[PDB]
Amino acid sequence: WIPVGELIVLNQSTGPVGRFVYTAHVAGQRNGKVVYATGPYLTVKDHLQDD
Amino acid sequence: WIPVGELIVLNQSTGPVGRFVYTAHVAGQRNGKVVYATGPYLTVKDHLQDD
Amino acid sequence: TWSPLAFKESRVWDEKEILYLGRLADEVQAGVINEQIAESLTWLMARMRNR
């Protein structure tokens, strides 16, 4: 992962350097209103009645 | 609405001149039987989980 | 004899503007589409009364 003749040099601290942000996506509806969610999602499409 | 130099002249009765009629449209089914309705309808199609 | 007339119409909201639009003054977590459809739902009722 770190290439063979290379190294990293950490500066003033060794803590969390940055942040990863999940933003919103579209979920289903609840009462005719669009519902939203963040992070990863898994949608299920049971077309178990088609021809 | 009634224009400027114009007027309307009624006749033998001042009651309702005519009638507005709604006819039947196809609503959803209830128990496998097609159910009908009259008047203005308003249908919602949510495809909030597709491609 | 007498036979009626038919008239209907539709409107669709695509995928970008459902989750991307908030208010113009502040910062909003994506709930303005539910405000904006309910006006547009009321507007189509005014279309049929106008017709």
Listed residue (C28, B28, B17, B45) closest to A29, CA to CA: B45
Listed residue (C11, C8, C6, C31) closest to C21, CA to CA: C31
CB atoms near residue C33 (< 10 Å): 19
Question: For residues C11 and C44, is the Cβ–Cβ distance under 8 A?
Answer: yes
Helices (H), chain A: none
- The answer to whether residue C42 neighbours chain A at the CB level (below 8 Å) is no
- The two tokens of residue B20 are 């507005």
Chain C residues in contact with A34 by the CB 8 A cut-off are 18, 33-34
Chain C residues in contact with A33 by the CB 8 A cut-off are 34
Distances (CA, A) of A32 to B14, B42, C15, C38, C43: 45, 13, 16, 9, 17
Task: State how far the Cα of B24 lies from the Cα of A15, in Å rounded to an integer.
Answer: 70
HSE, side-chain direction, 13 A CA sphere, residue A34: 27
Listed residue (C8, C13, C9) closest to C38, CA to CA: C13
Residue among A34, A35, A43 with most chain C CBs within 10 A, to mutate: A34
Bridge partner list, A26: A36
Residue among A30, A31, A41, A43 with most chain B CBs within 10 A, to mutate: A43
Find tokens 């996506």 and name the residue: A25
List the end-to-end C-alpha distance of chain C, in Å, as a whole number. 23
Q: Any idea what DSSP says for residue A1? A: -
B36: alpha, beta or left, given left = phi > 0 and alpha = psi -120 to 50? beta
Task: State how far the Cα of C50 lies from the Cα of C42, in Å rounded to an integer.
Answer: 13
Chain A residues in contact with C18 by the CB 8 A cut-off are 26, 34
Cβ of C19 and A33 within 8 Å? no
Task: State how far the Cα of A49 lies from the Cα of B40, in Å rounded to an integer.
Answer: 32
Helices (H), C1-51: 16-20, 32-50
Return the SS3 of B29: strand
Task: State how far the Cα of B46 lies from the Cα of A34, in Å rounded to an integer.
Answer: 9
A11: alpha, beta or left, given left = phi > 0 and alpha = psi -120 to 50? beta
Question: For residues A41 and A25, is the Cβ–Cβ distance under 8 A?
Answer: yes
- The two tokens of residue B50 are 């597709």
Listed residue (C35, C1, C11, C18) closest to B42, CA to CA: C11
Cβ of B49 and A34 within 8 Å? no
